[PDB]
Amino acid sequence: HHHTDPMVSKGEELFTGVVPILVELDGDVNGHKFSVSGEGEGDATYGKLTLKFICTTGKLPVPWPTLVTTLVLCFSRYPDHMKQHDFFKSAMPEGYVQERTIFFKDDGNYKTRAEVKFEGDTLVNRIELKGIDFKEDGNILGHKLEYNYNSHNVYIMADKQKNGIKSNFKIRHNIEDGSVQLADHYQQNTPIGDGPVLLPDNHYLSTQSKLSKDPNEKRDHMVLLEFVTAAGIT
Numbered sequence: 001h002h003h004t005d006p007m008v009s010k011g012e013e014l015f016t017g018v019v020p021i022l023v024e025l026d027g028d029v030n031g032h033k034f035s036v037s038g039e040g041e042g043d044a045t046y047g048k049l050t051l052k053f054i055c056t057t058g059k060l061p062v063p064w065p066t067l068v069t070t071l072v073l074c075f076s077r078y079p080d081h082m083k084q085h086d087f088f089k090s091a092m093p094e095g096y097v098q099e100r101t102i103f104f105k106d107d108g109n110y111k112t113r114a115e116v117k118f119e120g121d122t123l124v125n126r127i128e129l130k131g132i133d134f135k136e137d138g139n140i141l142g143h144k145l146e147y148n149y150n151s152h153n154v155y156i157m158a159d160k161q162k163n164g165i166k167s168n169f170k171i172r173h174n175i176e177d178g179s180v181q182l183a184d185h186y187q188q189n190t191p192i193g194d195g196p197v198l199l200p201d202n203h204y205l206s207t208q209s210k211l212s213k214d215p216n217e218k219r220d221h222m223v224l225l226e227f228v229t230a231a232g233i234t
Contacts, residue, residue: 001016034058045077051223095118164199168187
C-alpha cells in the first residue's frame with residue numbers, strides 16, 4: 001500500500017486484494033492422458049490460497065498429492081522488509097514461466113512447463129506435464145500415497161544470467177505403510193516480458209498445505225488450502 005520503491009509498488013498493487021485463480025493442466029503419464037481444472041482465490045496479504053481441482057477426464061491416474069507443487073508462488077506473503085526480493089510479483093502482469101523436473105526416487109519423473117500470467121483480472125496457471133518411466137506397481141501408479149501433505153521450506157536463489165530464479169528441493173510424500181516417497185524437485189523461473197524484474201537475494205519460502213474433500217462432489221477432485229511465507233532475511 002505504501003513503498004518507497006515504485007517498482008515494488010507496481011507489483012504489490014496487482015495483489016492487494018483477493019485475486020481469482022484458474023489452473024489448467026494437460027498431462028500424460030506413461031501414456032495415461034488426463035486434464036485437471038482448478039478454480040479458487042489467492043490473498044497474498046496473508047500468503048493464502050484456496051483452490052478446488054477437478055479431473056475433467058475421469059479418474060486421475062496419479063495421486064493428487066504428487067501434483068500439489070505443480071498445480072502459484074506469486075501469492076506468497078513477503079514481509080515488508082523483503083518486498084524488494086519478490087521476483088514472482090515483479091514479473092506480472094506479463095508473467096513468468098515455471099519449469100520443473102521432478103524425480104520420484106526409484107520411480108519415474110515429471111517434466112512440467114507452466115505459464116503464470118494475468119488474463120484480465122484472473123491469474124491463470126497453464127501447465128503441461130509429461131511423466132515417463134513410472135513403475136506400474138510403484139507408489140505413484142499404484143496409488144499408495146496418503147492423502148496429506150507435509151510442511152516444507154524451500155530455498156530460492158537468483159539466476160542472474162537468465163534474469164530469473166532457481167530452486168532445488170525435496171518433497172517427502174507419506175506412503176500408506178508409514179514409509180516415505182521422496183520427490184526431488186529442480187525448478188527454474190524466467191520472465192515472459194522483457195521489462196526489468198526484481199532479482200532476489202537468497203531467501204526461503206515456508207509452506208504449509210492442507211488437503212481435503214468436498215463431501216457433495218462426485219468427480220475426482222482435491223480441495224487445497226495453502227499458506228506460503230517468505231523468510232530468512234533479518
